[PDB]
Design a protein around this ligand. Structure first.
Ligand SMILES: [K+]
Ligand SMILES: [K+]
Ligand SMILES: [K+]
Ligand SMILES: [K+]
Lengths: 258, 258, 258, 258
């Protein structure tokens, strides 16, 4: 329900909403569909019972109530009235409620899926540490990916487990006018990544953690994304292939030493 | 409507929405159901009146309009037209509006319940004060519980009533990359929990108050949770049983002295 | 559309949503109702036209299409089919779309009204300036009013027009565990309300401006409220009648000199 | 999909929601309408097929199923039952689902459009730099434009590309009680716009960038707006025509030297 190995409390139900809002839009509707079917049968197989018959329609039996059902659960009432007997009515009433209620939770999950924040921030499969305007400085570079932003990013660091406050891999600029961002930080004394070697990190399970946060002007939702680099991912003495006016994005991740 | 003894202004109505969005999902739908019924009768008992009859259907009387009603309030129109007389029509029109409108407020409360933030932060039934990397420091440890976060926590303290600003039981890190958080604070001079003994607190109704706040990347809602420790809950000279790679929360709360 | 005298750009439409989400819930539904009617007529009076008749129902003429209409706009289809002629169909189709669409915007405004933040912060009709634990200090006191919070408040000040940064009428505590809050600030040198008399303010159109901001744990919406005091409202050398365990709220605003 | 020249990954679908929530409200509904039509045909042209006929209604052929269709997709069930044959039923069932589902995504996009933040911040077509209370200071002035706020604004500056941290064109007040805001900043040493002339900027493609951010108390959405001034837009040695008690925005933009 989380990131590497969990044993805690859970409950089918919620786990379900999860899928509801994480699945693809066809797999979604299919999901309903499949449920529509299952929910149309269970009511049909509850019609061929009772104190009297139902399917006063074209279909002889079952296939009647079914196509009857698919006229009430969804509440379309088409026009072949089977309000013939009480038991018969009840069932049909119990249905009407449901489907009406069902349409809700569906129209419901729908909006809930729409509401999923909509922008996404993509980060460089690889970090890099190079010499810059003087001293040694680290670098990570991310960028928008659909409906822009204009964010601020904090940048934390993990070794040993103590999570050290690294001058925000923004250390130079905590924010920016995002439509191409190159987050970076000087490794001078002040910094905790001082005298530390690729060998130094490696042993401390060292991790570079970054999170950009910005609001989507289009929906004003403030959506934040995070990203983690494993020590062996910080590729040394390199740089990012230039990308640009226009930016072309294919080679975003690659690097080359210096 | 609040925490220990209130006497103030109020108004039924809202108090209701409350329940709407705090009750269990069956108790919910039942609620509607029950209301559906009540709302189907009141319209039926408004049919057996007027200038003319209604139930031109299977049911002789009442049980007719009812099962008629449950064809309009929900708006299913099935197919036994009782638009026979004016008065008869009106009633049926007044209905149609309603139910149509009713379905709304229901589909409505629904989304409003979905929208309830969805993550929850769980805290250690017990605080703890132990020696760490040198001096005496307090500790509380909380963790996610369904759809993660990545929050910041302030930590306040109560004795006596003056609520003292304790260097955020985050004093070391006001935030973190939450998926296991261990909030803690050094008790040196600067700190207000300095020279204070289990006996010292006890008399001041001393309380440890903590609140983590973070946004759910999945819905971007910023949901905060709080938690209070009673002085006799801060268990001294202990530590938290280790929990981890994997974390097994089963033993999240336990501790063992040092 | 704003607070004392405006002349700018506007547009009926939006001004309308305004009312939609500011009116009372009956005035609301009435609003629709009234619109339902108006929207049922305009379609009826568009039926008694065309290439052929419509009202093949109980009502002789008009009152027929109407009660017909109120069977389609809302989309209930009851059961007296007037799909007799093309023109006749069209009209009925144009309708079906609408009402279906209309039900939307209605179910729509509905949720939009629900979504109105739900907590409200009430402030003391009167500020007060009294001597406290030593020096002269100002004071304002607000409190919840339905579904609590736990907020932080900034406090600004206006004279001359320059809006001076007054050590947040929280100057002592920028936040609190809100369920009765008494915001206050020392008037020592540091403070801009230093040597200033009721006569001093009065001439500078002096204003005390306050805003509390907190999140509603129940909906996680962060709702802020503001409040302004006119110089002659800061009542001097007084205090707030005590109010309290339980708080009883009737005399919240009153004061008495010292 | 962005601001000057892009070449990157994408996918129709989302690009669509975009339009959904950016188009005008008629162009909207038209959009649906047009789709209603297209979606009514494709089902009709799927009726004149199968193992048996359909249009047992007024219209001889096609125009029958169509007006039939427009009775089910929308789910109105009017009353000329064509549940005559299986194939015939299926088609009609496949429809019912859809339209029911379709109404959702529509009621859906609807709320999603409503939810578009609703306030907007307007800025002075022209900046200005004048002498104030002593030294030379810059100035920009913005103001609400429908449902107020109460925001905080950061103010950045561009020359050359290095984006210099200018003491927030709020440098005097980072916030305010917005209902007329006049953002300004002293140009002393500390400031990066020090000794720089209209000629100095011009060559560095100099840009004044501002962004106000505040929450709409009415919906608690925090909506931010931005605005950029081209160096030749900062009009020197001027001021803003006064606007006020009442403010008449008609003359919001104008200025006059000093
Ligand atoms: K119907
Ligand atoms: K019917
Ligand atoms: K019907
Ligand atoms: K019929």
């Amino acid at each position: 329900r989380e990131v590497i190995a969990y044993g805690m409390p859970a409950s089918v139900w919620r786990d379900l909403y999860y899928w509801a809002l994480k699945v693809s839009w066809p797999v979604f509707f299919a999901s309903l569909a499949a449920l529509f079917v299952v929910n149309n049968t269970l009511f049909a197989l509850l019609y061929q019972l009772g104190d009297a018959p139902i399917a006063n329609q074209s279909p002889p039996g079952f296939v009647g109530a079914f196509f009857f059902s698919v006229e009430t659960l969804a509440t379309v009432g088409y026009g072949d009235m089977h309000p013939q007997t009480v038991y018969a009515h009840a069932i049909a009433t119990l249905e009407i409620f449901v489907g009406m209620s069902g349409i809700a939770l569906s129209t419901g999950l729908v909006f809930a899926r729409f509401a999923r924040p909509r922008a996404k921030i993509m980060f460089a499969r690889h970090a890099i540490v190079r010499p810059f305007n003087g001293r040694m400085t680290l670098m990570v570079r991310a960028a928008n990916a659909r409906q822009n932003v204009i964010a601020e990013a904090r940048a934390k660091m993990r070794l040993m487990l103590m999570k050290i406050h690294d001058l925000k891999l923004v250390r130079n600029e905590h924010p920016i006018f995002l439509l191409g961002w190159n987050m970076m930080h000087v490794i001078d004394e002040s910094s905790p990544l001082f005298g530390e070697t690729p060998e130094s990190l490696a042993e401390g399970r060292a991790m570079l953690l970054v999170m950009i946060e910005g609001s989507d002007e289009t929906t004003a939702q403030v959506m934040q994304a995070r990203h983690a680099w494993e020590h062996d991912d910080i590729r040394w003495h390199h740089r990012y292939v230039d990308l640009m006016t226009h930016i072309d994005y294919t080679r975003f991740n690659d690097t080359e030493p210096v």
